[PDB]
RNA sequence: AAUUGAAGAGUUUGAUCAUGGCUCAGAUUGAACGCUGGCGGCAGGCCUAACACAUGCAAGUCGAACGGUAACAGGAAGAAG
């Protein structure tokens, strides 16, 4: 599995004596073809914070319908604020992408797209938009079982 | 063969998510200014005062339309070193 950390944040919570700081980690993890998952962790350190992420993000991984290492299809994913669009592009043209959009897409397996974030680009809810986005793709032949064809007729 | 094409980031908070403005990374120019400055090719060069303008030049040509002959170049006559 390929790994990335996408970002570390300071938290920091009040107490009588004054604050707690804290750290989170949010890492993705994938095998390069079409599974892909992400982790959130939480720690007083930083390196236990991504330790715990990386863990969370092996455990809850999901399978996505890839191509080429590109889309099916135009997709939209959203997650709170986040809106995300996601394009399938042709051979060179890359990872046409935001940081949060471009990590999960890497490990994802996916080499060539073309990407958007619209409304909140908070990682956090980028990384969900674009899973959201990728694991409700469809590929042609669950198209064709759904709808009782063949593919040539889809 | 001839529309293969779309990236975000900083900043409100003790911290958070959202909302929302401000700001930045890009491309561009008849540019200007600062520092610096070797050569070439190709292009460009009053964006302001349609303000005022010295001087030179930017519209002539035809004798195969015409009377002519001021030039000067021949030609013919008539005479002087
Ligand atoms: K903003
Ligand atoms: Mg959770
Ligand atoms: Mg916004
Ligand atoms: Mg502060």
């Keep these: 599995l390929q790994e990335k950390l996408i970002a570390v944040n300071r938290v920091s919570k009040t107490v009588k004596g004054g604050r707690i700081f804290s750290f989170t980690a949010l890492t993705v993890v994938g095998?390069?073809?079409?599974?892909?998952?992400?982790?959130?962790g939480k720690a007083?350190?930083?390196?236990?914070?991504?330790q715990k992420a990386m863990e969370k993000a092996r455990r809850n991984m999901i399978n996505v319908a890839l191509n080429n290492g590109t889309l099916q299809h135009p997709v939209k994913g959203v997650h709170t604020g986040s809106r995300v669009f996601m394009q399938p592009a042709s051979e060179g043209t890359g990872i046409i992408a935001g940081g949060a959009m471009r990590a999960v897409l890497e490990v994802a397996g996916?080499?060539?797209v073309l990407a958007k974030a619209y409304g909140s680009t908070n990682p956090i809810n980028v990384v969900r938009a674009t899973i959201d986005g990728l694991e409700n793709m469809n590929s042609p032949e669950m198209v064709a079982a759904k709808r009782g064809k063949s593919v040539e007729e889809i």
């Design 44 to 50: 007083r350190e930083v390196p236990a914070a991504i």
């Design 31 to 40: 095998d390069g073809n079409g599974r892909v998952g992400f982790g959130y």
């Design 110 to 112: 996916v080499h060539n």
